[PDB]
Design a protein around this ligand. Structure first.
Ligand SMILES: CCCCCCCCCCCC[N+](C)(C)[O-]
Lengths: 220, 183, 84, 73, 183, 183, 183, 73
């Protein structure tokens, strides 16, 4: 009675991989599927050892290990489109390593992932990342401000946004985050009430708002 | 077999069954007539079934509508009760109309009850509306919010596009394959 | 006009209902107490005159706690119609 | 002048209605208790006063009458 | 066979059948008379049938009309109630007239109830109207909105073309072939 | 044979039969007297008949008239109620008059119920009228709208040609040949 | 076996079982019908079960809703009571609507009850709202607070984003494996 | 002025109650004696007068009114 026979009728929903640790690994695509699988093991329908895994869990676990042994490494994300050969994206500018050091890193990652045969390390450009973010916000016609720091970029999107804007912003941010993660570029979205509706005012270098006749407000 | 719940309504029981099947728990529905429905599961699945029943706070409540608080069996109704019943009927008739639009599966609507004061000697306040709706997969949500706003705006004497909030979402993946039976 | 017509009908109607229940209930009591003389003289309603006398005050008090609310609602309604 | 007088009588009409209701109900209850000979004025008058103070009729009248002419916010 | 629902009435049952057949689920309707109709399906389809019943929130509600909040049985009723009944009857008569135009399969109408105020000491606001309708396939919707607006404008004392919202949609594809029976 | 509907009225059954025959579905009507009429079809046609029943929302309602909301058989009447009955009868008498014109098959009329305010303290508003009608094939619609407008204009104290809306349509193709019987 | 609790209801029993299972205590639920449910455990686990029953203050006393203090079914009502029932119905209808959003497992909502002043003569005061909600694991909480605020803002005549507090949390780890039986 | 009037009615309300009670007692006694065809007012007005004077109602009333506004000492 193989494990694949126990997961259901839809076969291609899951992928079973043997590991050097003498344990079966079940690769899932999302939380719902993850729990659909975990139930089988927790019920005890299978007699040998098995484990369930997914991309978000593995990214978190590996980042927690990196925090301890490489506390200054600049990197983006690990992609598991092909689970036998993950791809690890590192910053070209912020890192400084030799080829030997990169190889050592590769081998230690391979020891953390007993289901993978090798890990490919690829160097990506930060300017590219930041540019794709800004281009996407322009494409969506959102209002924004950009702030630059030594190791990160922050985009502030705040005001009296409309429903359409909220929806399109949410969709875009969700798309970008899945590609680049949240380490280098951050988006801050904030709603605030419109002070200016229905009031006459001067705008320019010397703006002010008439709160009413006889009352001047000078923000600065 | 262990008893989870008894004396359920038809529309509670079907919701529990749906939630357990989603998590791969095979369940059974039994009818006792005047005693209602009973739900049962196997022992290996009992723990999980308990955890999910708690986490979703099942069985579900009856659904609440403002007109229940002001039953028309009255010797006298104040202005306040009549106006409340009125608005609580409009809310329901709007939801029932939105479900007829193309591709909408379900929706909910809310109206700002000014009726919590009579406007007694006071100028009237404008109306605000909120709506939630669920769409079929592959729908251009951005392009469909416009239709809803346009439709709601003219349903009332004075409404501004600024005062209408609309939130849309897509249906989740379909649960077609049956759960596995414990070995 | 239609406001004057409404408030007048509502008055006649309120009189009919608020005077209904007390006289029906008193009829039922007076009937059953007249009938069960057919078994026993049933002194314990009407013999203890002090208790019959208290009963009236009790009834009037309780009843006012059910009708004053109604009249207050009606009063507010008519004043609203008169001035607004 | 004439239109004002008319509109005043109209108001007075509405003010009378609840007290008429009281005056009838109280008589019918006294008849239900058989005390046919007692004059009901002796009991109806205090009820009317209670009703008027609980309704706070003076405040309502004084406010609404002004509201018919002024505009206050 | 597993029981999905009991005690339905005729118009609830026919809707449940229509929805399940659309998704390739063969279902059976049984009549018990005073006990109503029952719906049954095969085991291989039980899971799917449950999931769809949840997704569409079946069985459907009874249809709501504002005249149900203000029963004409009442012996005396305020001018507000009467005005509400009046409007709630005009709405229905309009829906029934639109359903006679060429190509319309069904429709809905909504009117702005200014009775949310008595309009005491104040001028009455202008009327606003909203309408939904479904057309036969191959209809020039753009050219047909004009007729509807023209027809609605004159049903009230004061209406502007700006205050009339109209939303149209086409009928979905016809379900003619029967679903397959489980092997 | 499978049961579609039970307890219909005569005028509901004939409408259903008409709609099914138009789509090539052979149906049978059975009479149970106090239990009403029943409609049945063959299994090969069951699916289609269900889908059409849902698409048209059969069986049809009764027909609403505003006079039904203010019955003459009632113990009290406000002036508003009397005024409503009056208008509701004028409408029906116009509908019955147009059908005697040459070529008109059927018609419907709507009047502006200005009575939804008293017209107290204010000058009354002008009347507005709307009419729908259906003509036999080969009729000059353009040349026939003039007659209708002329006729309607003088039925009220103050009406302008600008305030009269008229919509005309032709009869669809005749359904003369019988549907084919399932093999 | 030692008796922990007797005469429980169905929801209290399932709550206790859930809490005990989380701490690895195997418990049994027994039904006595008119006497309710009873919970029992083994002696080696008695001490622990006692300590947890105290620490969580079990069994849970039932849910409070403000309409329970001013029960609608009465001979009499007063403006304060009516206004209270109204607000206590809007609260419940909003919570029931939020639980339909994508990912939300449960939520709770609170409204500022200004009715503790009559708001007669005294001018009425602006509304404040608070909400709690629990999400499925892997949800961008930061990006989801905006939607909630947007939705709530338009449910009332006058609300500022500054006056709306929202607190979100994720679901805890799932309890799927059964506890071990004492040796 | 509009608040003073309302206070006056509030006070007088509570003074009416005991006299009402006395009227009910008299009527019930005449019925229990069956001495039906006598109007009770003729009997109860002497009783109300003698009772209130014998208790100096006017004195207590005057003190109770002044003590809202002064201390007599
Ligand atoms: C003998 C009892 C008399 C009670 C009179 C109550 C006032 C009725 C005023 C007329 C009300 C009916 N209305 C307005 C249609 O005339």
């Amino acid at each position: 009675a193989e494990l694949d026979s126990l997961l259901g009728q839809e076969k291609e929903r899951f992928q079973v991989l043997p590991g050097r640790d003498k344990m079966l690994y079940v690769a899932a695509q999302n939380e719902r599927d993850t729990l659909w699988a975990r139930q089988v093991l927790a019920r005890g329908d299978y007699d040998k050892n098995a484990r369930v895994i997914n991309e978000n869990e593995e990214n978190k676990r590996i980042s927690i290990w990196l925090d301890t042994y490489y506390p200054q490494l600049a990197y983006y994300r690990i992609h598991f489109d092909e689970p036998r050969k993950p791809v690890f994206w590192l910053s070209r500018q912020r890192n400084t390593m030799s080829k030997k050091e990169l190889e050592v890193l590769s081998q230690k990652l391979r020891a953390l992932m007993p289901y993978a045969d090798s890990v490919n390390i690829t160097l990506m450009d930060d300017v590219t990342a930041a540019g794709q973010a800004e281009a996407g916000l322009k494409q969506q016609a959102l209002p924004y401000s950009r702030r630059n720091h030594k190791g990160g970029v922050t985009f502030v999107i705040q005001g009296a946004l409309d429903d359409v804007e909220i929806l399109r912003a949410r969709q875009f941010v969700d798309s970008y985050y899945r590609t680049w993660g949240g380490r280098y570029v951050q988006f801050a979205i904030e709603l605030k009430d419109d002070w200016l509706k229905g009031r006459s005012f001067q705008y320019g270098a010397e703006g002010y708002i008439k709160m009413s006749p006889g009352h001047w407000y000078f923000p600065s | 077999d262990k008893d989870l719940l008894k004396g359920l309504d038809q529309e509670q029981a079907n919701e529990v069954i749906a939630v357990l099947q989603m998590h791969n728990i095979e369940a059974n529905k039994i009818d006792s007539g005047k005693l209602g429905y009973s739900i049962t599961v196997a022992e290996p699945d009992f723990t999980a079934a308990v955890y999910w029943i708690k986490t979703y706070q099942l069985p579900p409540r009856p659904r609440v509508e403002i007109a229940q608080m002001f039953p028309a069996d009255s010797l006298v109704s104040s202005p306040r009760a009549e106006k409340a019943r009125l608005y609580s009927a409009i809310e329901q008739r709007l939801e029932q109309s939105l479900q007829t639009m193309e591709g909408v599966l379900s929706a909910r609507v809310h109206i700002s009850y000014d009726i919590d004061a009579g406007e007694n000697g006071r100028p009237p306040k404008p109306v605000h509306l909120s709506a939630l709706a669920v769409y079929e997969r592959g729908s251009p949500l951005a392009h469909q919010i416009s239709d809803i706003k346009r439709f709601l705006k003219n349903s009332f004497a004075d409404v501004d596009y600024d005062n209408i909030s609309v939130v849309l979402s897509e249906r989740s993946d379909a649960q077609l394959q049956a759960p596995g039976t414990p070995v | 006009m239609d406001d004057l017509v409404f408030a007048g009908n509502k008055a006649l109607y309120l009189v009919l209902i608020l005077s209904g229940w007390p006289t029906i209930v008193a009829t039922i009591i007076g009937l059953l107490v007249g009938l069960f003389q057919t078994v026993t003289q049933l002194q314990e309603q009407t013999l203890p005159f002090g208790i019959k006398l208290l009963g009236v005050c009790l009834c009037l008090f309780l009843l006012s706690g059910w009708y004053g609310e109604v009249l207050l609602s009606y009063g507010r309604q008519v004043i609203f119609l008169a001035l607004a | 002048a004439l239109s004002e007088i008319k509109s005043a009588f109209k108001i007075g009409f509405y003010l009378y209605l609840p007290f008429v209701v009281v005056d009838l109900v109280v008589s019918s209850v006294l008849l239900a208790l058989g005390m046919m000979m007692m004059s009901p004025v002796t009991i109806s008058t205090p009820i009317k006063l209670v009703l008027f103070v609980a309704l706070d009729g003076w405040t309502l009248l004084s406010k609404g009458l002004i509201l018919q002419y002024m505009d206050i916010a």
